[PDB]
């Protein structure tokens, strides 16, 4: 009975900020691997950005490095992503995806997902 739960989504206009959260209970949260993930109706789900168990350790997407900011509190076991600049091209569901050890970076090595929370950028 692991359970990732998302938040913090919802519309704003482009140049806004957003902060979604990723709440996590069952297994223990620090031996996994937190990834961000996004799909737009007909295209692949994109990574987005990935952390380490500790915390250390962050990657981005080229596209929103500097804009975007991943981090996690394993005492409260929930993994952040603030988004800022928003533009329309991050429109999208962004799905949080948990990896054992590893952090996954493509869709396939996620072993557990949350609901996904949808992000909308008007302009």
């Known amino acids: 009975q692991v359970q990732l739960v998302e938040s913090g989504g919802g519309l704003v206009q482009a140049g806004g900020s957003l902060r979604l959260s990723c709440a996590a209970s069952?297994?223990?949260?620090?031996?996994?691997?937190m990834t961000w993930f996004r799909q737009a109706p007909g295209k692949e789900r994109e990574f987005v950005a990935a952390?380490?168990?500790?915390?250390?350790?962050?990657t981005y997407l080229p596209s929103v490095k500097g804009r975007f900011t991943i981090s996690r509190d394993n005492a409260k076991n929930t993994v952040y992503l603030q988004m800022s600049s928003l533009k329309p091209e991050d429109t999208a569901v962004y799905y949080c995806?948990?990896?054992?050890?590893?952090?996954?970076?493509?869709?396939?090595?996620?072993?557990?997902w949350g609901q996904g929370t949808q992000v909308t950028v008007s302009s």
């Open positions: 995806g948990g990896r054992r050890w590893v952090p996954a970076t493509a869709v396939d090595q996620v072993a557990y």
């Open positions: 069952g297994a223990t949260f620090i031996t996994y691997g």
């Open positions: 952390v380490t168990g500790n915390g250390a350790g962050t």
